[PDB]
Design a protein around this nucleic acid. Structure first.
Length: 48
DNA sequence: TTTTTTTTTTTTTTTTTTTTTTTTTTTTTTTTCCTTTTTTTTTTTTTTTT
């Protein structure tokens, strides 16, 4: 255990694999809006 | 000389086919491309002639 130093009772499976980072970060996906631009036709909020 | 009996002519439905019309999960993120075009008429320009 990292916090206490105690042994883990169940033995665990460790080893090297090959992992891939994907392009879907959260900085390209986080979005928030309070008040902003509206459409010129229906005066509803925009897209995207 | 009138009654029944056959024929005709609409009359309403039936049934099948054809046509028409309307529909097709929710949300989100990036690029790319286009947002004219050839044809015809009009106007200006340039060269030539007397």
């Amino acid at each position: 255990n990292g916090h206490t130093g105690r042994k883990i009772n169940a033995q665990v499976f460790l080893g090297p694999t090959y992992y891939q980072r994907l392009k879907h970060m959260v900085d390209d996906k986080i979005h928030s809006r309070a008040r902003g631009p509206v459409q010129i036709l229906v005066r509803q909020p925009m897209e995207g």
